[PDB]
Symmetry: D2
Subunit: 379 residues, 4 copies
């Protein structure tokens, strides 16, 4: 049977508890009698859709975390239409990332929550917490950055231009539009012919899994100004990592101001987010950092549920400046890195108490079942 969101993918039980123009907040039904006091808010990429994190039941990171006894909230992004063709990077920071933190924290009744980002979700959520810290607000107990670029050095975009030249910016706000985006071709063509040829080639000549291809093919639109800002200030000019260089939502962005315990994950054969580029976050972030390297590629490495006991991962408590030095002292362990992370997350999440009986609270009651209608909208 073909893949269908809400039928055989993204089926972990939950409810939409909040929605605005930019996103729906999902809250998942408890699967345990007790849960940690502090919930986990997941911020997935808005390049493709969130359900790479809740793919099928056996492979779902959401379901796994719920079964370890955490309350999980998740940002399901709107797939923007013409009405959002002028949305900016700042709009997304304020009205989705910061808003989601506020609503999840309100529902939880806790002073602090745990947060997670994946891929550009990690870049987004890190920017949001840096904005909040400059406002004097510290709503996060800890941060998990899965496969996240903060330092974009050596991602390859300028390679073909370095040796042109003789031997001797225009504001993003001026753009409007919706640009198709996907993960595996985010720095590659996105057109009918490329998509046709690449998809057909991979399905017949490689073991790339079909549910990955379905997720990647379920494309999302990026608003013009948002895509412009992201391309300009990260991949091209690499300014987010320069403390105070960028102003976002009225304040300078200094990633060191986040200043909470942070778990930083990358995959060794990942060529979308090089693992050395993820590791470069250890030079930027304050407080107690942990870096963990999973084996294999961009998705295969992150989505490696422990039950199957496949692959491996490396740990090293020392954090030298150079990633090769880190790997030289690292120990390889059999199987999934997920138990390493969930044990770390448990230490950040407070004591276990009786699970909630209902979704949301008086202010934010259930709207409709997870996965929600936003994730079903086509580009």
């Amino acid at each position: 049977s073909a893949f269908e969101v809400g039928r055989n993918v993204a089926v972990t039980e939950g409810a939409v508890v909040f929605e605005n123009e930019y996103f729906q907040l999902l809250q998942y039904k408890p699967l345990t009698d007790k849960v940690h006091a502090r919930p986990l808010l997941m911020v997935p990429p808005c390049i493709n859709k969130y359900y790479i994190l809740d793919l099928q039941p056996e492979s779902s990171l959401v379901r796994h975390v719920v079964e370890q006894g955490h309350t999980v909230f998740l940002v399901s992004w709107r797939n923007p239409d013409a009405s959002m063709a002028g949305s900016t990077w700042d709009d997304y920071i304020e009205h989705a990332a910061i808003r989601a933190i506020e609503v999840a924290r309100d529902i939880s009744g806790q002073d602090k929550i745990n947060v997670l980002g994946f891929a550009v979700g990690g870049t987004i959520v890190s920017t949001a917490l840096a904005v909040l810290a400059a406002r004097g607000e510290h709503p996060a107990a800890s941060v998990t950055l899965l496969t996240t670029l903060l330092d974009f050095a050596d991602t390859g975009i300028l390679d073909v231009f370095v040796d042109e030249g003789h031997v001797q910016g225009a504001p993003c706000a001026l753009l409007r539009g919706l640009e198709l985006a996907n993960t595996f071709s985010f720095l590659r063509p996105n057109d009918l012919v490329w998509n046709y040829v690449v998809d057909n080639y991979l399905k017949g000549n490689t073991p790339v899994p079909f549910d990955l291809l379905f997720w990647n093919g379920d494309a999302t639109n990026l608003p013009g100004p948002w895509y412009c800002w992201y391309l300009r200030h990260t991949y091209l000019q690499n300014e987010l990592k320069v403390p105070g260089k960028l102003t976002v939502c009225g304040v300078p962005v200094d990633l060191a101001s986040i200043d909470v315990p942070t778990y930083i994950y990358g995959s060794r054969e990942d060529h979308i987010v090089p693992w050395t580029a993820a590791y470069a976050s250890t030079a930027l972030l304050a407080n107690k950092l942990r870096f963990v390297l999973g084996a294999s590629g961009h998705i295969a490495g992150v989505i490696n549920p422990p039950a199957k006991n496949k692959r491996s991962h490396w740990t090293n408590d020392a954090l030298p400046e150079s990633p090769q030095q880190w790997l030289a002292g690292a120990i390889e362990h059999h199987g999934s890195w997920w138990p390493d992370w969930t044990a770390w997350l448990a230490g950040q999440a407070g004591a276990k108490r009786a699970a909630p009986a209902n979704y949301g609270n008086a202010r934010y009651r259930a709207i409709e079942p997870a996965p929600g209608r936003y994730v079903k909208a086509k580009a």
Copy 2:
């Protein structure tokens, strides 16, 4: 003054002597009293337009070759519109590459002509001569391949997919359409935001020259089936280099059947056509081969006129299997590789005779002045 094709770029004097739906054949006015008996037919890429080879007068390869005493013909590709949305790779081989060889050879009155390809023009013209050889036809005295991919190994398209998968084609003729193409982003996004951000970034933060950016920004459309075939059978499946694997215009393609003296050029810092990938052509082609490596990038290396006496180039008469072995024995020479090539081309071009007084011949008289109206058509 802004760049304008036919006013301050692509201004070498000439005439259109033939045209069909796919291209116009240009013939340039002699600048010398005598010319070699055999003319040179240039086949430029149809990704962007031909005039990278006739950019400004100081930098024009066309003008330089005409001033060395060769009759030059050149393929100026149609910029396809809706009527050509179904054109195929075979259509282009038969009705443009092979057709241009036939018309140029007819006008010249010679039994054989010299041919040149640049970038995908070199792939196109090599395929055409292999098709012709299988028909028992040998219209070329020699072939010059500038910055040409024939073996597409290690061009990078499959990199992000190699480590996806668990631990354990649809015909191009079905597509229609016109897809925007340019050279520096042929394997990169082509959309309004990318083009805006990249162009603005390069102009303000790099010495990439403005006439290069103008040429690259002067985009061309690729017909759906053509783009599908090119992507599938070269970059993805790398089959052109497998003798007899591909059937084109009714015959198997064996690049070894071209079998004429061949000059093979690449640029050392070229990351669009890696110089080692150009060098791999030496393993495929029969007859007497010469490989020459120019310093610098994709365009800077090829467009290096000798008058300025800039950069350098390497030569080595030995042709080991490995490019690093070639470079280890190579000698570096000061300045442009153009004199090396034109001296080689003179040896293929026959004796010098009085230059022609008029364009074309009785069958093919002048239609309109170079650069012709096809090259002025926008995508």
Copy 3:
């Protein structure tokens, strides 16, 4: 307890059945009631000693193969002294590799034997079989090449010399001597200070295993002319892979003349024998080839016994010219590649018969117990 050859490493039960100036032939005691008709002759490197293949009982490749029901013979190289300071590459081919094939085949009473090489042992044994084929002799049923260089392209020795030069051999037989050699620093310094600093660094700051370091530290001498020939004609001039280019023991060496079923193994993170360099053997060898890629480094990848169920390996029955194309279509399987190989080897080894009661035969009776005295000799 410290490592000691014959006490807690290299302890698989066996006997020396033959010896000359160059090597001792070991034959291991059967561990099964029946064995395949055709035995396996292992040719280990003479850079360091053989017992990387019989390290500790849990990690021993020899013991594993004996327990799968093969008679195993093995070349234990002399550690040369002053009397051998003039030994040549040809001497080793004739008086050790070819001699070992002859003696093992004689003892077995079989028309053909299976052979295995590891690292330079694979280069040696491939050269020997190519020499034998040119003599009209085909003593091998199949060949297993573990981590073997035949095509030495891109091994890195010329890298630092490629860009020296202005902008514009002495016979190996003349050398005498013994040069210290080890595996991990074969292309690196071998001196008291390097060995002291590197060993101390690895033991205190990495998980490199101590038995690996013991084996690597148990250095062997290379005769001057042998080391000269190996360096010159493989790493530097890469001529073994050129059919007929080199003359060895009176005949031209054409590796395609070996022409038997061949199993070719490499390890993905191996930077001593790059896996792509091992893969390049598929372009040289005739008959039915299988290529298998193990995960991890030079030794960790090869020495991965299946009982522990660690790591992974890739298979692909297609053999494209390019290794990246091979990997793109490859399937990753959990755990050790050893079962893949032993199942392949069983298909080459004939039917199972009662195991031999005694070592050797009338001509070659047991001399002394394995591991033999040659392997205990210090450099």
Copy 4:
């Protein structure tokens, strides 16, 4: 005529003005009527000998600087014998680098001198100035680092060990000895066979120049403890770049404490000192930095005298963290970088005054002519 130090190489006119067990201080004869008030002290590598900087007259950096009107002093290292087999890194810092600064400064009568280092000479002289700064001493007006490693990340020594290990220091002062060293094989074998095969191969099959090979073949001894310390604390543990991590001559080493205008040079195709590794010095050093990239290899790039007008070099006044960003904004200029540097050096060297009539001063009179007897001593 064969190369001979003091006859046709290292012939710039000068005198030894000081000597101790570790080195001779050379002072060159003026070639101009006036010289800058501040002299330049050159600290060459002690791996091979100094005269790579005074090779032949046309190629001599020393002669070129003297002809631009600077007084040049130079450290000519002792080639250590058995009496120095216990010399340490600290011994060399105190009794050669710091001593040479003191003597050159005394002879000059100036409060500050300019200093230059090349290769390990740059590492040595940077350490010495950092030691002096911690003592409250600032004898340098400016520093020139040619092809110098300070940050040794990614130099490749740990590559072969990173993927060994299961799935789960001894003081340098204890060594004695003299270890042969050269530049192009400093991380490669140094033995009779390697040297024989490599030298013979390069001379017959590459354009590597013979005077380079002569210099490289003129090997120097490294004392055991010195070589141990250098290997351990730079290439292996990369600690010099960690402020205060290493204690040298009784004080912590913080390279930021040097704090003088600094010219940092690297060569683009240099694989002994990667240009990106040289560039990494810009992250360590205080005060006004300039980085300049020369084209070509380790020696070809540095030794590029301007008279011949060969090669090119890049400049960029911006200093981003990433070297690729630096190169993307860099402008390529024709020919040698030497005029760029000497113009920079003139700005550091004070006003021009009448040249000295005699070598040295009352305390330090001429001992013997340059090049001196130390440089003639064989290993």
